[PDB]
Amino acid sequence: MESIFHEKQEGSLCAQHCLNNLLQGEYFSPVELSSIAHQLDEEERMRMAEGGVTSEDYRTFLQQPSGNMDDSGFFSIQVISNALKVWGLELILFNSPEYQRLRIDPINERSFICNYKEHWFTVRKLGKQWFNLNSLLTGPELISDTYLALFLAQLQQEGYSIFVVKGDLPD
Questions:
Q1: Which residues does the annotation mark as catalytic?
Q2: Cα separations (Å) of 160 from 32, 70, 79, 114, 115?
Q3: CB neighbour burial string for 5-18, b if at least 16 within 10 angstroms, e if fewer
Q4: CATH architecture of 27-70
Q5: Range list of H helices, 123-170
Q6: CB–CB of 139/132 below 8 Å?
């Protein structure tokens, strides 16, 4: 376990920490990601307020830009999804027909992302065991496949946002 990035910091949902941890290494800066999000939110705010006439408005609005609170409500799915898309990773909402369409298993998944009201969670697959981490966390959380399926299942059946990240990662 001398390969897992160990670190403890005070905060809530970090863009750089999520991307850096997801990629299993430093591959992005906090200032860069912060600026990107600010621009996306601002651009979406102006484009939304001024209205729009195109499918872009539908998809953009559906994505649910901006946030509501602070601490964790800083970044946006648009920024995260974008950073992943450019890498080859795509997010699939469990509640969406996409997740069920391909019928991608949880334990067979490569990257997972949980979203809780005013809180974010980053999950990644490591060999035969899963690894969880977040800006609010102080250390890596090891989870088994048999427990992962039920773990996430409890969230979806309860009232959480489970996102499936599939694609090609560097690590």
A1: 14, 119, 134
A2: 29, 19, 20, 8, 7
A3: eeeeeeebbbbbbb
A4: Orthogonal Bundle (1.10)
A5: 145-158
A6: no
